[PDB]
Ligand binder design. Structure first.
Ligand SMILES: O=N[O-]
Ligand SMILES: O=N[O-]
Ligand SMILES: O=N[O-]
Ligand SMILES: O=N[O-]
Ligand SMILES: O=N[O-]
Ligand SMILES: O=N[O-]
Ligand SMILES: O=N[O-]
Ligand SMILES: O=N[O-]
Ligand SMILES: O=N[O-]
Ligand SMILES: O=N[O-]
Ligand SMILES: O=N[O-]
Ligand SMILES: O=N[O-]
Ligand SMILES: O=N[O-]
Ligand SMILES: O=N[O-]
Ligand SMILES: O=N[O-]
Ligand SMILES: O=N[O-]
Ligand SMILES: O=N[O-]
Ligand SMILES: O=N[O-]
Ligand SMILES: [Cu+2]
Ligand SMILES: [Cu+2]
Ligand SMILES: [Cu+2]
Ligand SMILES: [Cu+2]
Ligand SMILES: [Cu+2]
Ligand SMILES: [Cu+2]
Lengths: 332, 332, 332
């Protein structure tokens, strides 16, 4: 009887940050209420000024990370304002039935809908738009995110002991397919609908023009680099709704990794690089041991350094010479 | 002494169906006899009427699923009728030695051969044609299938308890590389041999023109959708002999998954999407909990919805509102 | 106090061979000293005579395999002779901090440097050059290798029992992106620097022109085929610093496989094919049971047989008819 359960309303935050939550559940099962507003918007995705018409949940690419516990109910109010132009919906990979909710959430501009599902399987999971006949166009225009369903007793290592993170970040990785003219220059369009047949052609090459974290080349750098301190335990949730990726922390490891993101399985230990298949979210746990700049990349290094799939961590603290040291500095 | 073992002759069935077998072995080890006839045939692979010269085992793409138990012997009579034009052979990934049988089964048109091997490792495994110097051309023209070697005591979950399936389907996923003219139109040829150098060029792009289940765009839809009922336990065996895929059941999960297909390993639990590497067969177990239409896709959604790698399940039974419900239907 | 530890100097060998080492550590922790000299050189990579300017560690592609034990210290003297033209460095995925050593090892032509790091995690790991702003160009010109950090008590199976190998080989798999003219012919350049902007363009296609083992099409064939005898236990270490691969031993299996290369995890058993993600090293253990020629391939068979990712094993010993036999040889 869902009417007797507590309701809690969560206000979402912009990636790569994640809304406040408890790791170990401090209440019984709840109905967790979220609201998302769909926003079609122009986005500049690279240093050259290339512009696309992005399709977003809550204004960002990726959409925000939702966090619940196993056997909570997720109730999402999804709003498609009349300032948009397309029909949208939502498919949660966490959910069971009706194409993950997709069959029940088709909203034209000026409509809203409220969906409820029970979060029966713990893990991180992708969610994405999936309108009949235009599924890859919406997804590859940015209309995807993830949801984390924590076990009620939090995360566990390969021996069943508790793993507690101090910080959590969400990296959404996006493959874009910007149409090109004859000579290879990117095309601009005034409306999303203009791009349609050119988008289909660009997608069928299976070759992205850009692969980015958090919606743009260089988004997780400079003032927007991820931060941590030596000794901190960090969980990085990484999703890719359409195409395989292989995350790597340059200068670190994945101490505990759930590459396909499902927490009833034991983690893989000591990973250098891990494969997250397209249509999946994964999670990696690392304890920082050295200060400085780290790069977090898709380790197809062309995809990283030429197409955009690279961000930075900036880590403060004390250097440990026992782990690494320069014995003789570069000299002639 | 193989002469004292029982022989049993199995008549194969067309994918996605699978020949009758017992999960738990009801006899001791047997010599299991199969016959396959090679058929080169014209195939229409898409809605536009694109035609290729396919190279098939037993008339289908994929070839049929063979099912034995661990430590049975597989005896295959392979027939290459004189109405074909090419030399063919067979390589079983399940077998040990002689290039998986490939070195011993080279049959010109008008020849046959009988191979026997011991099925020493349990799992699902790819088989494919692999003639010296033309291996990828045969495989990517459809000349591949799979064999399942069950443990004698059937399948087990991660705790070693029995898993029994009620139904089993075989999805063979095929990457095709149809040659194109200058403008991008598909070429037609009168014989398989005509296509050869154009096929090599198309393959070297590493970009398929079509990726299909069961030999054509839309093959596992409509009247040919897969079926199940709420409460049924379904095993889906999925192979890809040449290129990685990432299956996903839209609206469901892989409750127990052997992504690389080998049953002495514990399954991965609660998977949203899993990676089957090219040259591998995998298997996923799911118990249906909700009725309706499900889509089973490669979750590179371009490969699914633009290139053809999507099929449907149609599931009958009772809707469970506790798992999912529309609280407020789309409305303005 | 590192000054009181034993030092040992290791002389490296050319892949696919591996320098002598003990599986089970016969000493306490040591400082293990290696020297590598960077060599930019012209390399012929295919039968047609296509030439590239390769960037190598110690003259080979891949660079040599280094072998230490967990909690040894690795001290590498890296030398960039003044006959080279570019700045280079080294990033070890095995190491913790400073971009895996990359930030501390930038050597112009005519410089050297000595780096020390503690090998705290057991596994096989990639190392590669990674100079600021030109990372994929160096890596995809051949400037990568691997390091194996053995547990002090050697390798273990899924039940924690010892696994001892009789022979070990190192297969480095390399994706090359040779620039092409308008018609599709490969370009030649006099110096590495000439190629730069053409290399970036070729890389951005994400489509390699060649994928090779040990630096050339056919390198591990003929007189240079890998060898073993029936009954021998062979460990094959395989790396790919930039792009996913899916190794398969044609006619065999991976009896015990660490696909992502980290030995605190239990191995996967009975693998037909396994995925090594780009930026990773993996390891497979197999006991040969049948004599003859085996092919070891990336099982995207186009990448194998058209682009070059195939080698051979030649195995001596006795044929076992119980495992496989021709019952009726090909006949009309
Ligand atoms: O405002 N662009 O959808
Ligand atoms: O856009 N309707 O709430
Ligand atoms: O599905 N693309 O890796
Ligand atoms: O192929 N996915 O990077
Ligand atoms: O070691 N990072 O490419
Ligand atoms: O899917 N579990 O890593
Ligand atoms: O009949 N075509 O091979
Ligand atoms: O085609 N010979 O049986
Ligand atoms: O091997 N192709 O994913
Ligand atoms: O790259 N395989 O879809
Ligand atoms: O959730 N299916 O793409
Ligand atoms: O290969 N076993 O999933
Ligand atoms: O000698 N070529 O770098
Ligand atoms: O090249 N300096 O040792
Ligand atoms: O990262 N390329 O498979
Ligand atoms: O996509 N890697 O073969
Ligand atoms: O079975 N080798 O492709
Ligand atoms: O990463 N261990 O296979
Ligand atoms: Cu949408
Ligand atoms: Cu999906
Ligand atoms: Cu054939
Ligand atoms: Cu094969
Ligand atoms: Cu370099
Ligand atoms: Cu790296």
């Amino acid at each position: 009887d869902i009417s007797t359960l507590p309701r809690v309303k969560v206000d979402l935050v912009k990636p790569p940050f994640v809304h406040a939550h408890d790791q170990v559940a401090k209440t019984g099962p709840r109905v967790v209420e979220f609201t998302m507003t769909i926003e079609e918007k122009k986005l500049v995705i690279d240093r050259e000024g290339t512009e696309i018409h992005a399709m977003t949940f809550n204004g960002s690419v990726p959409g925000p990370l939702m966090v619940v516990h196993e056997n909570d109910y997720v109730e999402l109010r999804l709003i498609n304002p009349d300032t948009n132009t397309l029909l949208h919906n939502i498919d949660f990979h966490a959910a069971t039935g009706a194409l993950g909710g997709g069959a029940l959430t088709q909203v034209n501009p000026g409509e809203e809908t409220t969906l409820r599902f029970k979060a029966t399987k713990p893990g991180v999971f992708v969610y994405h738009c999936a309108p009949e006949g235009m599924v890859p166009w919406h997804v590859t225009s940015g209309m995807n995110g993830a949801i984390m369903v924590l076990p009620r007793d939090g995360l566990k290592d390969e021996k069943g002991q508790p793993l507690t993170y101090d910080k959590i970040y969400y990296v959404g990785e996006q493959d874009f397919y910007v149409p090109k003219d004859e000579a290879g220059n990117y095309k601009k369009y005034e409306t999303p609908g203009e791009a349609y047949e050119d988008a289909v052609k660009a997608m069928r090459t299976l070759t992205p023009t850009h692969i980015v974290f958090n919606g743009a080349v260089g988004a997780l750098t400079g003032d927007h680099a991820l931060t941590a301190a030596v000794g901190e335990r960090v969980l990085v949730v990484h999703s890719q709704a359409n195409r395989d990726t292989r995350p790597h922390l340059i200068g670190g490891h994945g101490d505990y990794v759930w590459a396909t993101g499902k927490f009833r399985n034991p983690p893989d230990l000591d990973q250098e690089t891990w494969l997250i298949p397209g249509g999946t979210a994964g999670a990696a746990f690392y304890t920082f041991r050295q200060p400085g700049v780290y790069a977090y990349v898709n380790h197809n290094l062309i995809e990283a350094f030429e197409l955009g799939a690279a961000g930075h961590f900036k880590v403060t603290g004390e250097w440990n010479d026992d782990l690494m040291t320069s014995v003789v500095k570069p000299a002639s």
